[PDB]
Coordinates of C-alpha atoms in Angstrom, one line a residue:
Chain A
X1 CA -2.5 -9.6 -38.1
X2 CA -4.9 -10.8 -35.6
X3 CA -9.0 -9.5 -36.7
X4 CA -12.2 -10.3 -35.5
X5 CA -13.7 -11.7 -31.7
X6 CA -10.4 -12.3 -29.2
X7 CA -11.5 -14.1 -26.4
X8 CA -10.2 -12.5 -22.5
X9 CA -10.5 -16.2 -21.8
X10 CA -11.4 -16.5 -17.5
X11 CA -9.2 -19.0 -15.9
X12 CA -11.5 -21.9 -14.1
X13 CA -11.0 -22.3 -10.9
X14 CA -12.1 -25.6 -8.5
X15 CA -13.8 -24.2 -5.0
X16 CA -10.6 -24.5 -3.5
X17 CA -9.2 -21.8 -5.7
X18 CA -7.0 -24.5 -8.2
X19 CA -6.8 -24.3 -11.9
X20 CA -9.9 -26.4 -13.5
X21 CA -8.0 -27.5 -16.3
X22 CA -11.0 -29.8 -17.0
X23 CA -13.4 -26.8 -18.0
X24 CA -10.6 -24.7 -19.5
X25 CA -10.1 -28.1 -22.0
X26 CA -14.0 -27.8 -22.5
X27 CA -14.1 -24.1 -22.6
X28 CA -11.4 -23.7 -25.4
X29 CA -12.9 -26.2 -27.8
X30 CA -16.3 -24.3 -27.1
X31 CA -15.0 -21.2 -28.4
X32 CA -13.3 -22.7 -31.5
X33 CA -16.5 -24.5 -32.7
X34 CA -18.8 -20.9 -31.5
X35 CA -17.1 -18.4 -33.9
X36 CA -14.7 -17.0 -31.8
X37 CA -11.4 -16.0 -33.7
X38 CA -8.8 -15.6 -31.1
X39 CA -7.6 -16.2 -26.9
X40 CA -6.0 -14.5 -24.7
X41 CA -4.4 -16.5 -21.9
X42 CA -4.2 -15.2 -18.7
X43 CA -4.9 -11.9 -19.2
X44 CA -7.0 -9.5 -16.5
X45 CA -10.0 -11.6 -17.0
X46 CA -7.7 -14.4 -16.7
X47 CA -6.6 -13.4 -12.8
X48 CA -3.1 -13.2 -14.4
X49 CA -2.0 -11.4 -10.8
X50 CA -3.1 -14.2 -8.9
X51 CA -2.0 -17.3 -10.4
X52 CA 1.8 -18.9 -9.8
X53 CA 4.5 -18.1 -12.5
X54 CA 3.9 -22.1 -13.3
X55 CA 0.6 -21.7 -13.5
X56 CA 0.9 -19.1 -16.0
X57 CA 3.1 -20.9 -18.3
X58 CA 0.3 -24.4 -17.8
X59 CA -2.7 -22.5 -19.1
X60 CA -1.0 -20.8 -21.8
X61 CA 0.8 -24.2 -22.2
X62 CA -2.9 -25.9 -22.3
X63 CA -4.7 -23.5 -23.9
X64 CA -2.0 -23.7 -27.3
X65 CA -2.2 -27.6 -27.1
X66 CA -5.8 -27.5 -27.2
X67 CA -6.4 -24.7 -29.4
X68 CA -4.3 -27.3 -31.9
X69 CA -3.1 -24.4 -34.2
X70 CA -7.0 -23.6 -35.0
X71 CA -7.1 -20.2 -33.9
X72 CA -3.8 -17.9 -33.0
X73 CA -3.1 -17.7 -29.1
X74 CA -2.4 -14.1 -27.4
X75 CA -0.7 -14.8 -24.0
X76 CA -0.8 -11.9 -21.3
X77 CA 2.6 -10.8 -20.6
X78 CA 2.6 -7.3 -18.6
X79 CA 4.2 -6.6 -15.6
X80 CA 5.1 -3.4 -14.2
X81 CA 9.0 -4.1 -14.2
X82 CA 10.8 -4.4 -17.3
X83 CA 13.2 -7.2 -16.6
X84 CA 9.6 -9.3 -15.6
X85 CA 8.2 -8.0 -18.3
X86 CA 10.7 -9.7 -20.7
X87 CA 11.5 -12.9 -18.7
X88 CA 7.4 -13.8 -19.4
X89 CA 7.6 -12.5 -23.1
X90 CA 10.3 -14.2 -23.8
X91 CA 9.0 -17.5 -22.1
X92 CA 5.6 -17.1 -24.4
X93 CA 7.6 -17.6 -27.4
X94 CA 9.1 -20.0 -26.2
X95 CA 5.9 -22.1 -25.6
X96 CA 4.1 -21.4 -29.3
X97 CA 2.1 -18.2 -28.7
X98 CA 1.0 -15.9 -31.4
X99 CA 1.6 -12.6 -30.2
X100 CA 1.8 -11.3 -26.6
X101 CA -0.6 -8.6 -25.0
X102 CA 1.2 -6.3 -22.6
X103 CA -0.6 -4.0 -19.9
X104 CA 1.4 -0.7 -19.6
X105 CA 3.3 -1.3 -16.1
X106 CA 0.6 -0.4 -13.4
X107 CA 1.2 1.2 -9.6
X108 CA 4.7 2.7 -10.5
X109 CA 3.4 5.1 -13.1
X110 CA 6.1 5.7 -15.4
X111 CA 6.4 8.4 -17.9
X112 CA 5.4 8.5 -21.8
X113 CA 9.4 8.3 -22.7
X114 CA 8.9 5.6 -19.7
X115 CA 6.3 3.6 -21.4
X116 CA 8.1 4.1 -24.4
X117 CA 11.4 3.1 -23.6
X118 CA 9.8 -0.3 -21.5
X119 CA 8.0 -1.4 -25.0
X120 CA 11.2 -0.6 -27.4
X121 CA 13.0 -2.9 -24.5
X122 CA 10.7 -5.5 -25.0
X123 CA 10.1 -5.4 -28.6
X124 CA 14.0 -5.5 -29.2
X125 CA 14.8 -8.2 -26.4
X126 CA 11.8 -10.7 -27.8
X127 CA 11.0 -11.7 -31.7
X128 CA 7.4 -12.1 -31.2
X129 CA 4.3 -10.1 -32.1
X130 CA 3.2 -7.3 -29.1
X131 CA 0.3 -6.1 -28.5
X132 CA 0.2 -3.1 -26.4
X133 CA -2.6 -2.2 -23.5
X134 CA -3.9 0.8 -22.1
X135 CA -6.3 1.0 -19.5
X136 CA -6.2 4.0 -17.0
X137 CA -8.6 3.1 -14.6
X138 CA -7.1 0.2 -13.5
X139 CA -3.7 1.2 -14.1
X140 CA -2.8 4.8 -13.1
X141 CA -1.3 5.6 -16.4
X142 CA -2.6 6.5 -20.0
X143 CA -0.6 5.5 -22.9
X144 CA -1.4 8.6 -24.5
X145 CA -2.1 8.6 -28.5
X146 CA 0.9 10.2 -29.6
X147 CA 3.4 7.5 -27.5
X148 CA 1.1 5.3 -29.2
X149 CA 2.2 6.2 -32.5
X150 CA 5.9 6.6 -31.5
X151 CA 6.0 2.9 -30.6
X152 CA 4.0 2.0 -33.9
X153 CA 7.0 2.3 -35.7
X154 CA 8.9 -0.3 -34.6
X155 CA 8.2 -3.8 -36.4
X156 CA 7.1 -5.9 -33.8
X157 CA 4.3 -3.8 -32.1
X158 CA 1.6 -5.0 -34.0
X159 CA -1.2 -3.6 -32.0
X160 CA -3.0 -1.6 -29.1
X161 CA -5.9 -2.3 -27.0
X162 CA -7.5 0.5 -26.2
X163 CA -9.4 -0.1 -23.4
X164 CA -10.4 3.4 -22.4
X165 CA -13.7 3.2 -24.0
X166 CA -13.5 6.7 -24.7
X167 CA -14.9 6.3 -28.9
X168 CA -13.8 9.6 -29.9
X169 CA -10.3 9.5 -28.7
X170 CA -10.0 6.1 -30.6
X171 CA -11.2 7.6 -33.8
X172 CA -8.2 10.0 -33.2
X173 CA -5.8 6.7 -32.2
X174 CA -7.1 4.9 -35.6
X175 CA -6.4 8.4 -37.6
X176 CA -2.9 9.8 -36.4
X177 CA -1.6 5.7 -36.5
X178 CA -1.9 5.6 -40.6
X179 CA -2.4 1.9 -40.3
X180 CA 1.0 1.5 -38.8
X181 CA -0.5 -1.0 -35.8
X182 CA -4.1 -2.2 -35.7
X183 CA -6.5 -1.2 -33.0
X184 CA -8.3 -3.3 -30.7
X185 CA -11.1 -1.8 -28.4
X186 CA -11.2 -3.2 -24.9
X187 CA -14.7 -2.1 -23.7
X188 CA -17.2 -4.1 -24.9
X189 CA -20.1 -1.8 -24.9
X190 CA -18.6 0.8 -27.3
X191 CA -16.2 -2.1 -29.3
X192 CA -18.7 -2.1 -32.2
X193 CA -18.7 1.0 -32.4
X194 CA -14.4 0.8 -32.7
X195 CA -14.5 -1.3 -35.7
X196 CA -17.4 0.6 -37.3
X197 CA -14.5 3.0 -37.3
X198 CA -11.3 1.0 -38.3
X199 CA -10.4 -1.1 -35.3
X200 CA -9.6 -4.7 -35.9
X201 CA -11.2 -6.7 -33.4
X202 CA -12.6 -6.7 -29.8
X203 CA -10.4 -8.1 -26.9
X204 CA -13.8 -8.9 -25.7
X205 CA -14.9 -9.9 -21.9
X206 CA -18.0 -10.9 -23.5
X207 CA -17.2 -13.4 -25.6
X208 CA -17.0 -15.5 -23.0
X209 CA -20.7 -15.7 -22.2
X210 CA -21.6 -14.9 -26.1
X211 CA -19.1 -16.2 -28.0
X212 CA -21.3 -17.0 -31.1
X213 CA -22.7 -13.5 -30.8
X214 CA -19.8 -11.3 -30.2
X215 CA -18.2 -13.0 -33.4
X216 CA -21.0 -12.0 -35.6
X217 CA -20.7 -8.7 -34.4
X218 CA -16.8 -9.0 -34.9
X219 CA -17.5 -9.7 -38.4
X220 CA -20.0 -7.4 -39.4
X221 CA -18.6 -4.4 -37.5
X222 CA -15.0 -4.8 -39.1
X223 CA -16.9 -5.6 -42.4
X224 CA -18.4 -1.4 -42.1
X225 CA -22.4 -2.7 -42.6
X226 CA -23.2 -0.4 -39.5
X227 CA -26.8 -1.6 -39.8
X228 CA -26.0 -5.3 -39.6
X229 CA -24.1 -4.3 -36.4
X230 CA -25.7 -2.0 -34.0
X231 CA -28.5 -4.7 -34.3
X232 CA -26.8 -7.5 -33.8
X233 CA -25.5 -6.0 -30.9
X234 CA -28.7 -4.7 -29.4
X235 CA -28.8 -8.0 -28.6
X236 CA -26.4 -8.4 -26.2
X237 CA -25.8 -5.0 -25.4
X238 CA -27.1 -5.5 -21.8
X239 CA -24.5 -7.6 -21.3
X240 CA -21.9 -5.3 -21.8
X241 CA -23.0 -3.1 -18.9
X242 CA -24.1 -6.0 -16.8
X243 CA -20.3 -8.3 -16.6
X244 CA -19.1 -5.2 -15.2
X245 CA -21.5 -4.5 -11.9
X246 CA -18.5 -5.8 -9.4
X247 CA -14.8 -5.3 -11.3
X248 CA -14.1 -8.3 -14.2
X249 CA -13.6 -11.0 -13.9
X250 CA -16.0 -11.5 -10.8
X251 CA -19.2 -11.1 -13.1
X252 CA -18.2 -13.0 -16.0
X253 CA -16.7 -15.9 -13.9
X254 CA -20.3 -16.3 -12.2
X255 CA -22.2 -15.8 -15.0
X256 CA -20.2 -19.0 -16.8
X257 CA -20.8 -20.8 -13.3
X258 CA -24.7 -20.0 -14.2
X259 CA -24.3 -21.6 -17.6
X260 CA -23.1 -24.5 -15.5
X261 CA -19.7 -24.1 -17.7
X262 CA -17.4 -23.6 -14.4
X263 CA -17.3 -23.9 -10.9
X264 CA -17.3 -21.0 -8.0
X265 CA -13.5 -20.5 -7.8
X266 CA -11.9 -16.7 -8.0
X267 CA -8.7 -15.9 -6.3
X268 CA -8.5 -13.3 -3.4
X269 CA -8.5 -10.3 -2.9
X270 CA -11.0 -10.8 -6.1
X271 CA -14.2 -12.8 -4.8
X272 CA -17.4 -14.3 -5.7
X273 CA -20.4 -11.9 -7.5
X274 CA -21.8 -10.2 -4.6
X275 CA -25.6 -12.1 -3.8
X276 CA -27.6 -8.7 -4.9
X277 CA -26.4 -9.1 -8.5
X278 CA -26.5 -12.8 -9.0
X279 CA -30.3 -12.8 -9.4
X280 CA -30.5 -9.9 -12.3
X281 CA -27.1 -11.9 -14.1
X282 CA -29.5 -14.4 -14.4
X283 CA -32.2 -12.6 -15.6
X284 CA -29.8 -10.6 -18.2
X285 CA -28.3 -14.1 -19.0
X286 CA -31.8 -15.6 -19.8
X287 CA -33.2 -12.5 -21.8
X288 CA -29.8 -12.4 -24.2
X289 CA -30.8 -16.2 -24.6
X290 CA -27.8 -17.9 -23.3
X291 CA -30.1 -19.8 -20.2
Chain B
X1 CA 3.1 3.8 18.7
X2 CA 5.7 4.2 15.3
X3 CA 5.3 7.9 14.8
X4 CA 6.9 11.0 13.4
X5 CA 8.9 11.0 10.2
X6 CA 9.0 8.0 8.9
X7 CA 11.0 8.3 5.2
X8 CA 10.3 6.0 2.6
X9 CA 13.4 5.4 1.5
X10 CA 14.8 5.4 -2.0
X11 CA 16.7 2.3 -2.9
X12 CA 20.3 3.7 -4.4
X13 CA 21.4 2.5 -7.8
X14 CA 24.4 2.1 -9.6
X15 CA 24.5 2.8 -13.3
X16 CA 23.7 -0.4 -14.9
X17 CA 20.6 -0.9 -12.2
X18 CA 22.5 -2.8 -9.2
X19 CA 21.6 -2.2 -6.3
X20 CA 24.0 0.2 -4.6
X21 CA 24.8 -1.1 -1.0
X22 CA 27.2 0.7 0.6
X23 CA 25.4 4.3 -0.8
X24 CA 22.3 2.5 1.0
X25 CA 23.7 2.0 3.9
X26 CA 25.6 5.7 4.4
X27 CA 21.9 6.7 3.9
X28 CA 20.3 4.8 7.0
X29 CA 22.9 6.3 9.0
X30 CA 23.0 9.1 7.8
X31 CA 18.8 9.3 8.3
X32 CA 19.2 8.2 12.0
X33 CA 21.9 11.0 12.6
X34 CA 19.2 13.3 10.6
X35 CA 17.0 12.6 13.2
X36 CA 14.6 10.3 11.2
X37 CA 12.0 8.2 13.8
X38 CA 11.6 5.2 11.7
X39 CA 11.8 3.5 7.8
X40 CA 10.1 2.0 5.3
X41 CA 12.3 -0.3 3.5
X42 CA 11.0 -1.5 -0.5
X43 CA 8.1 1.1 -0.8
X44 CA 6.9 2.4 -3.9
X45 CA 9.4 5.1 -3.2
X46 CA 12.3 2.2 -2.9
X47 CA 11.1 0.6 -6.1
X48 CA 9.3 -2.4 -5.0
X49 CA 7.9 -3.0 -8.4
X50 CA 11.4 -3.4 -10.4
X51 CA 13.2 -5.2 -7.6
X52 CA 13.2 -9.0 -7.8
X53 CA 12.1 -10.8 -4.6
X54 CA 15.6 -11.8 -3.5
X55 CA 16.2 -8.5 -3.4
X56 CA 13.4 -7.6 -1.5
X57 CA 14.7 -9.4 1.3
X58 CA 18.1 -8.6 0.9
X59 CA 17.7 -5.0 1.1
X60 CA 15.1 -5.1 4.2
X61 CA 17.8 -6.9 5.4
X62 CA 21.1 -4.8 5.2
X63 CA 18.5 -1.6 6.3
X64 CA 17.6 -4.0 9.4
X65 CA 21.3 -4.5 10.0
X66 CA 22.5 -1.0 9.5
X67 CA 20.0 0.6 11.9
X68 CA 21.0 -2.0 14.2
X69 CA 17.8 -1.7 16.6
X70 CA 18.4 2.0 17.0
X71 CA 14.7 3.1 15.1
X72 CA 11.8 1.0 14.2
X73 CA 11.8 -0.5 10.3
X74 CA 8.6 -1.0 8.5
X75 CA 9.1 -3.6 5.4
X76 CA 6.9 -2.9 2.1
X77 CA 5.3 -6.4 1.5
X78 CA 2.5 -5.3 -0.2
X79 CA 1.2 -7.3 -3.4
X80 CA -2.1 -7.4 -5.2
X81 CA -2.2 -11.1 -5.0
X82 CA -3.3 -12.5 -1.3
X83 CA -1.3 -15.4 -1.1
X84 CA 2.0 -13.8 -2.6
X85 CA 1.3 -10.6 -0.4
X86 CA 1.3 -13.6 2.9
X87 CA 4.7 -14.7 1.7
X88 CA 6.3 -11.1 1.7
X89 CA 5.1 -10.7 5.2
X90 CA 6.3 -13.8 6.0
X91 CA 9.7 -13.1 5.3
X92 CA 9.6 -9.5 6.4
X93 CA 8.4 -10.9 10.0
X94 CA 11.3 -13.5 9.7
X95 CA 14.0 -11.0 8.9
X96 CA 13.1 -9.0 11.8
X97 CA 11.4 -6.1 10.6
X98 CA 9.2 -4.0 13.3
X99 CA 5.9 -3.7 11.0
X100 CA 4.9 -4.0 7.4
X101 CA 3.4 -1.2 4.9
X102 CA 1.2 -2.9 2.4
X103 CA -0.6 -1.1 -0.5
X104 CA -4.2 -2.1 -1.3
X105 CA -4.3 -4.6 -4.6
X106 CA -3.3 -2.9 -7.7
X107 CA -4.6 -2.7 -10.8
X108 CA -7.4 -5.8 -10.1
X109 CA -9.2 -3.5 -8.7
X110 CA -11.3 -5.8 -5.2
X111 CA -14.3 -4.7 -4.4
X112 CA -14.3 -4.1 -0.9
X113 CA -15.4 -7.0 1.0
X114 CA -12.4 -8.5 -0.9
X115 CA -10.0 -5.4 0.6
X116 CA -11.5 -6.8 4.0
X117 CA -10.8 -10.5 2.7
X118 CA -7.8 -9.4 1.7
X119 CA -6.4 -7.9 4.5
X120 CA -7.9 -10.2 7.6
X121 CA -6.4 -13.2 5.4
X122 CA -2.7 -11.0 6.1
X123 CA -3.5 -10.5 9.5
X124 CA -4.4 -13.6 10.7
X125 CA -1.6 -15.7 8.5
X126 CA 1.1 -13.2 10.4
X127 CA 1.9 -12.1 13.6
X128 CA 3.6 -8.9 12.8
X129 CA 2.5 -5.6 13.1
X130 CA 0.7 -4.7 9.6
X131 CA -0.1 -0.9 8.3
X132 CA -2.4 -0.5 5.1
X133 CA -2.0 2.1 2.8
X134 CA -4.5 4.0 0.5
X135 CA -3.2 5.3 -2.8
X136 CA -5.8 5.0 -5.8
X137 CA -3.8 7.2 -8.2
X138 CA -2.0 4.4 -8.7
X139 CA -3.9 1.1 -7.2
X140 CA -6.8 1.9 -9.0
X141 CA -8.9 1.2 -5.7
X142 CA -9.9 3.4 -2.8
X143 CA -10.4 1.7 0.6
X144 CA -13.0 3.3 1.9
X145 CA -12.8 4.9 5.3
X146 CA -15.8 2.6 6.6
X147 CA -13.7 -0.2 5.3
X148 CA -10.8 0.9 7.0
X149 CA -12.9 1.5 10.3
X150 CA -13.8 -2.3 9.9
X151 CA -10.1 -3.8 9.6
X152 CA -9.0 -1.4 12.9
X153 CA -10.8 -4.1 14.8
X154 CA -8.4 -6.5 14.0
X155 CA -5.5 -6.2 16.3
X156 CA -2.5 -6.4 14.4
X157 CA -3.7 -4.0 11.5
X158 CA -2.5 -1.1 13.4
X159 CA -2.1 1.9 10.7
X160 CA -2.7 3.1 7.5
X161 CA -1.0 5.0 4.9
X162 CA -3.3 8.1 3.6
X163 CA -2.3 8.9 0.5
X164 CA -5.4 10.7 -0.6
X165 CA -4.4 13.8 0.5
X166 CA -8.0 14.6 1.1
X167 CA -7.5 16.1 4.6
X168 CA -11.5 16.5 5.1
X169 CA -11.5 12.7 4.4
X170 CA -8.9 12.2 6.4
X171 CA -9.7 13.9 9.4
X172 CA -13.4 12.0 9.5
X173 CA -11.1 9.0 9.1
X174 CA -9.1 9.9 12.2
X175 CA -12.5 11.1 14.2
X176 CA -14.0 7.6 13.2
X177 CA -11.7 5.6 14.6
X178 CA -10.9 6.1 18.3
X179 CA -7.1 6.0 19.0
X180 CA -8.3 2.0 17.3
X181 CA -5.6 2.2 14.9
X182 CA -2.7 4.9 13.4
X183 CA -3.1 7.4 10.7
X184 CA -0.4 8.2 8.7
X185 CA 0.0 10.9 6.3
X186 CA 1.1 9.9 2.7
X187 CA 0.8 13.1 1.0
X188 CA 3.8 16.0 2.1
X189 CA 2.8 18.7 1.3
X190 CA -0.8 18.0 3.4
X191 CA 1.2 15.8 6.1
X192 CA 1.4 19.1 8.4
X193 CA -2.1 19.4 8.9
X194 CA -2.9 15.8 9.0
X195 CA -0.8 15.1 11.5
X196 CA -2.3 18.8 13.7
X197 CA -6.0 17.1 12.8
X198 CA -4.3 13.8 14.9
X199 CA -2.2 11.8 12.5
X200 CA 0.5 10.1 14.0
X201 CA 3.0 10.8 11.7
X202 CA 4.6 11.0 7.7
X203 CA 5.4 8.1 5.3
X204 CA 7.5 10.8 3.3
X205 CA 9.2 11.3 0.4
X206 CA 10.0 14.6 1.5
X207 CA 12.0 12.7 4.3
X208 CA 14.6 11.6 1.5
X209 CA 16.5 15.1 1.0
X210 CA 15.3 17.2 3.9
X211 CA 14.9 14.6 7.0
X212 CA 16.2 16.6 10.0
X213 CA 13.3 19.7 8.8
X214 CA 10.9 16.7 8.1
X215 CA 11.9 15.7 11.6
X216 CA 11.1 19.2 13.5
X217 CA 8.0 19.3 11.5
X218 CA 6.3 15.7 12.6
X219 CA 7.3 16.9 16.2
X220 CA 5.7 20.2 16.0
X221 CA 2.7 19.2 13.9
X222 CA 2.1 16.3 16.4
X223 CA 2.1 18.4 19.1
X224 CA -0.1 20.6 17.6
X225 CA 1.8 23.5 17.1
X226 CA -0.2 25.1 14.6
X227 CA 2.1 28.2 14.0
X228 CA 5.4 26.6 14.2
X229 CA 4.4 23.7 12.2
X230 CA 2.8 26.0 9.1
X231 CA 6.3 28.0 9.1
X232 CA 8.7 25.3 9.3
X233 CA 7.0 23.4 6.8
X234 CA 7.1 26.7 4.5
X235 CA 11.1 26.1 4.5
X236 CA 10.5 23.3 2.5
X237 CA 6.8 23.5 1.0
X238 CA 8.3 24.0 -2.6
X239 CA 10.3 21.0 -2.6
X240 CA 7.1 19.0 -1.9
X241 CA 5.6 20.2 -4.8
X242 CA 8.6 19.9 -6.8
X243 CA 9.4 16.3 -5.9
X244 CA 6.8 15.3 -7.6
X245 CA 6.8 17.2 -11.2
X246 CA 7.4 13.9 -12.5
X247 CA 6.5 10.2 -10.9
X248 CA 8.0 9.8 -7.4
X249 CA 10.5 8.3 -7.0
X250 CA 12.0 9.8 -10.1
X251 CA 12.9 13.4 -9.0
X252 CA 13.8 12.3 -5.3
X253 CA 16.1 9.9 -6.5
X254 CA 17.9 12.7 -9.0
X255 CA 17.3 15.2 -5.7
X256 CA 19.6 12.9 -3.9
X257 CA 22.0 12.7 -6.9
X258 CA 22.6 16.1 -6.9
X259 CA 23.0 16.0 -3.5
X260 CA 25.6 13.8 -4.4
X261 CA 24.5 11.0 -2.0
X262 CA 23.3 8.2 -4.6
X263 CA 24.1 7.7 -8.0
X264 CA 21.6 7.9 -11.4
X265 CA 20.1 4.3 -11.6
X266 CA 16.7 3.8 -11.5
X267 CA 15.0 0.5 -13.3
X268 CA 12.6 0.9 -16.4
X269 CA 9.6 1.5 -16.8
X270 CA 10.9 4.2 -14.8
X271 CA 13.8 6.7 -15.9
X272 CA 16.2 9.6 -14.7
X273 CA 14.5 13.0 -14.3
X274 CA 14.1 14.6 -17.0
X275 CA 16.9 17.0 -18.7
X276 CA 13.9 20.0 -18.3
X277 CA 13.6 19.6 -14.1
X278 CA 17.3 19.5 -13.2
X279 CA 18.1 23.1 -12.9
X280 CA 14.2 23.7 -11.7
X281 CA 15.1 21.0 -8.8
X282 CA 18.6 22.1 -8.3
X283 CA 17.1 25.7 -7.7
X284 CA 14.7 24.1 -5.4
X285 CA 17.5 22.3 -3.0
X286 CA 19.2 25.8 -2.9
X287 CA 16.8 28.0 -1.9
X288 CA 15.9 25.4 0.8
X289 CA 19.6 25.3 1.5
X290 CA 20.3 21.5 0.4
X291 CA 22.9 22.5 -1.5

């Protein structure tokens, strides 16, 4: 079981909107010798909607071979179809990965026996680790707690990101699931705050600006020294609210391109940081210490 | 220029998830002897989402082939990915089709200037006539109505889809934009008044069971026949309502089964009605004598 800081690892993009496999090389051996515990390949903050099937398969094909067994590999696999979502599990495997990270389907909205059935598909179809993903915002659907714990009981869901931010409702999630599949916040700015209370790691968007940081505060938070935490992550708490300004991963992609870590490349219909909020990025990225 | 009722056609299913041809194709008649003014082929409503790209085409294809000129066809090519969403146009303007219905991105939620990007970058890569189509319940975006006052300017963006259902919204939307570009209603039970308030027509689900009332109703609305148009739509206001007690296209698809016109497959994520709406449903396609 996967624990600590997990990496929503941004794909690097030349101007012209091609894979920088260059900076990915750099930025994966960056994270590995910063603290950070885990990667997700092409996930959301991976622009996993814009890049070619291929393309999918070469980062999370890079990213393994680079990693070099150091740290376990999560490799975005969600689709909103079931047949998709298997063909790109499947293929995951296939190339080394850990575990997988699936989004519940998005657009079509399918029902809780929907969501159900579409996991219990997947897990049965695919021997690999799944980790499941709920995020209504972005979405349209909420895996509510009690499918949750339905699909905990089969032995390959080994996990749900819980993205909804909503700290009380995950206190309930970590409660009814008795252990049964670990927990996994995916907001940043309450994720502390998840593993004060059971959760096992943060799916963070962070940790790509503060990998060092958010592994400390990985560490602590899971280790329940609630002190040690909320002040480590005073320090980059800003953060948290301010890679979110314009949807992820436009923030976070520019505020690595300020750290002179990547280039300007994002894939439409996302585009670059919007001028207004480049200026207090840099400001946020120089208090937090990272320029 | 399209307007009326314009259904958004299911997309019949065998058991095991084929694709059901010849049931497709007694629909289309069928539709045009209904009196149905136009259709959107591959919609949310025809499962665009579970369908694989092969049979995108091949399904905008026998529709185009069945309705044999006889009543414009508008193909769903919409993707949240800008260079994928160009290639479904592509091959909906090279199979013919009239027009194409795209939904804004999904789930990666653009900001925007990056719907704008998104949309000119359509527009100017095809020559065919292209409609846009607001739906944040399940995009997880909302195209503003400034924004969509902006892409109007573009000649060959010549509709959009309101889903909303926000009539006060959507009549500023209409006022906004001179006669600039179309306005089609996405919601049924609110269609009626959007179309009285100028709309030019219905992208209906509605359209699927009842589409000779949906057609009388368009008419009437369009012509601003306040009084006919409230109590012709009351005939069928229920099943507007009804049709949606669970994801659409999940109860139209089981309407049309009792109906005995297509069969029960529909792909995961989604699945068949529920056991608990049949009798509710088949209740409602009596007392609107469907059945």
């Amino acid at each position: 079981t996967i624990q600590g800081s997990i990496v929503a690892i941004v794909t690097p993009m030349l101007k012209d909107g091609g894979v920088d496999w260059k900076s990915l090389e750099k930025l994966v051996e960056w994270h590995i010798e910063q603290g950070t515990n885990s990667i997700v390949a092409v996930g959301t903050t991976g622009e996993a909607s814009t890049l070619s099937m291929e393309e999918h398969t070469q980062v999370i094909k890079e990213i393994i071979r680079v990693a070099n067994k150091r740290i376990p590999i999560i490799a975005g696999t969600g689709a909103n179809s079931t047949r998709e979502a298997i063909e790109l599990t499947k293929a995951a495997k296939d190339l080394g990965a850990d575990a997988a990270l699936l989004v519940t389907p998005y657009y079509n909205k399918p029902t809780q026996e929907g969501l159900y059935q579409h996991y219990k598909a997947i897990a049965e179809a695919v021997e690999l680790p799944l980790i499941l993903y709920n995020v209504p915002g972005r979405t349209g659907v909420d895996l509510s707690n009690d499918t949750a714990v339905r699909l905990a009981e089969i032995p390959n869901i080994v996990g749900i990101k819980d993205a909804t931010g909503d700290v009380p409702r995950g206190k309930a999630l970590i409660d009814a699931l008795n252990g049964k599949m670990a927990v996994y916040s995916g907001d940043d700015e309450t994720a502390w705050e998840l593993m004060l209370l059971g959760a096992d790691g943060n799916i963070s968007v962070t940790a790509n600006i503060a990998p060092k940081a958010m592994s400390e505060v990985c560490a602590v938070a899971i280790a329940k020294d609630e002190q040690q935490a909320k002040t480590l992550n005073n320090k980059i708490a800003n953060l948290h609210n301010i890679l979110f300004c314009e949807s992820n991963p436009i923030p976070v992609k520019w505020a690595l391109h300020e750290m002179g870590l990547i280039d300007t490349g994002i894939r439409l219909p996302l585009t670059p940081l919007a001028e207004q909020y480049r200026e207090p990025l840099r400001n946020a990225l120089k208090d937090a210490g990272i320029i």
